């Protein structure tokens, strides 16, 4: 393996034809045998997909791929938030108010 093993974290839709989030992941030799928290943010579109897929593939090794289906079956999305209060174009307030 050497000093490091390089991986690609590819997060893609149900069709696996758009990468919603790719990122490089260096698994360094000091930090094998322990969990790496990789926090990222993926977009979710209005035809709510059944899954995303996280493929963590090796950058160097053939047939080194772990796919994980992030399933959206029991995913309760938050409500589409109310619109912000508008700046009503008030005539600007003198301090005598």
């Amino acid at each position: 393996h050497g000093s490091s093993e390089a991986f690609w974290i590819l997060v893609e839709d149900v069709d696996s034809e758009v990468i919603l989030h790719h990122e490089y992941f260096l698994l360094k030799a000091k930090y094998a045998q322990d969990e790496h928290l990789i926090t990222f943010f993926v977009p979710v579109f209005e035809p709510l997909p059944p899954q995303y897929f996280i493929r963590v593939v090796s950058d160097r090794w053939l047939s080194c791929e772990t796919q994980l289906p992030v399933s959206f079956r029991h995913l309760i999305l938050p409500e589409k938030y109310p619109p912000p209060t508008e700046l009503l174009d008030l005539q600007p307030l003198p301090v005598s108010a």
Binding site: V14, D15, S16, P47, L48, P49, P50, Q51, F53, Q67, P69, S71
Partner: protein, 96 residues
């Protein structure tokens, strides 16, 4: 009750089926389930396919028909490089 696997078996009428309404959708998305241990296409691995075979499933997307893992005899039956690269070309990979 049918056993005649031909294209015109006996007792086969067009009252055996009725066309039902089927329509398409942009409004929702479906998904796929592929087998877990192997993949789905056994048209090249035809002897490896039994009708009484057992398979688990996998929430994945299916590979193409002519994908690499579906025709392993096209990629795996190669003779190994035995006394190859001995009269090859000297070219230095300068960038790699």
């Amino acid at each position: 009750q049918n056993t005649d696997k031909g294209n015109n078996p006996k007792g086969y009428l067009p009252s055996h089926y009725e066309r039902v309404q089927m329509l398409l959708s942009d409004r929702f998305l479906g998904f796929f389930m592929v087998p877990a241990q192997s993949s789905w296409n056994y048209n090249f691995m035809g002897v490896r396919h039994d009708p009484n075979m057992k398979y688990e499933l996998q929430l994945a997307n299916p590979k193409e028909f002519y994908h690499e893992v579906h025709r392993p005899s096209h990629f795996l039956n190669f003779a190994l490089l035995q006394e190859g690269e001995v009269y090859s070309a000297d070219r230095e990979d300068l960038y790699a």
